[PDB]
Amino acid sequence: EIVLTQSPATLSLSPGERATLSCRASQSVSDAYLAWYQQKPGQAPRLLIYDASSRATGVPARFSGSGSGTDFTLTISSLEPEDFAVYYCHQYIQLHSFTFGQGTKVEIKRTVAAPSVFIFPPSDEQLKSGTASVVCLLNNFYPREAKVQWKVDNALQSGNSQESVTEQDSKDSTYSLSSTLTLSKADYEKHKVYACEVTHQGLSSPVTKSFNRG
């Protein structure tokens, strides 16, 4: 019934900066049956504020809320790297109907950081089974944007690597990334030099990590 509208969808800010998130209700939820939750990646929501403005135990002072009727706000007065999270409002005026806002994603800006690059060769254990996974790690970088290209012998390989990025580190706001090249044992054994070449704005010229099949 009561529709909560959160704004903005994403807030990209640096530490120190103020994050003010808005939550609008389709009808009055009173002197506030309104709450805010923080949801960090891989975790349950956590209560920050209830009754529009009441701070829950353990929630740091830099969090506060205000509003009544249909207009509410949550403020992180001075943003901290640990505040990377999605934030949700929740109205509970009639206990038979709980609705939530669509959330606001708070992302943390930082200084440019170079990826430390590593290459992993398949284990012998994996090879006995007839598959070769080759893993290239781009560690602790910023911003998100990176180019990982696989070089077998020296020809550009395509179409059989998957990437996965971690979420911004709670402590230093960096990303890490893995590129995994998966080949058949036969396909793997076709070539010799397996190379990972990483292009990032934290590096003056693209770094390459490689090993020779052995």
Partner: peptide, 17 residues
Amino acid sequence: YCARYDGIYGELDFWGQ
């Protein structure tokens, strides 16, 4: 997720994993 609330209030003060 399951979560616990007080009947006279309604905030979800504790959540399951």
